[PDB]
Amino acid sequence: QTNQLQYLLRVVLKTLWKHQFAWPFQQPVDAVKLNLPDYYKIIKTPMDMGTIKKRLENNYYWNAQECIQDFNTMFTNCYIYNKPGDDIVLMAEALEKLFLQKINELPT
Numbered sequence: 624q625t626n627q628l629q630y631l632l633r634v635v636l637k638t639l640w641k642h643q644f645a646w647p648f649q650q651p652v653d654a655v656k657l658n659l660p661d662y663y664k665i666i667k668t669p670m671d672m673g674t675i676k677k678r679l680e681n682n683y684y685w686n687a688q689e690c691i692q693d694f695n696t697m698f699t700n701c702y703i704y705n706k707p708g709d710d711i712v713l714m715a716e717a718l719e720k721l722f723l724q725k726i727n728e729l730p731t
């Protein structure tokens with residue numbers, strides 16, 4: 624019986640943020656820098672852990688499921704844009720595994 628959004632900020636996001644593979648997901652995909660003109664046409668709903676952090680810090684979310692959905696969007700965005708077996712995909716898969724472990728200890 625502890626608050627879920629608190630859990631998401633202090634435990635789930637903290638764990639994922641400190642991970643070795645977090646850096647490409649700590650801010651939006653800069654499509655100009657990387658020269659990716661199709662990224663924002665293909666990806667209708669950009670997401671990254673930076674925005675999720677901002678949202679948790681700034682009372683954006685209606686509930687914990689809306690935040691979980693954003694985490695899931697970030698991962699699937701990455702699997703949609705990139706070929707399977709790309710290194711960015713392997714990094715996301717690792718983050719997703721950890722995400723789902725930490726979620727399965729979520730209070731209620």
Ligand SMILES: Cc1cc(F)cc(C)c1Oc1ccc(C(C)(C)O)cc1-c1cn(C)c(=O)c2cc(-c3cnc(C4CCC4)[nH]3)oc12
Pocket residue numbers: 646647648650651652653656657659701704705710711
């Ligand atoms: C470009 C790149 C080279 C690497 F060796 C490793 C990574 C992770 C890598 O990806 C990124 C590096 C930096 C950044 C910054 C900091 C600018 O936001 C972003 C990525 C990156 C993050 N995410 C979530 C992505 O989905 C993709 C995708 C790509 C990418 C760049 N070029 C491609 C395709 C186009 C031909 C290869 N994909 O780069 C990123």
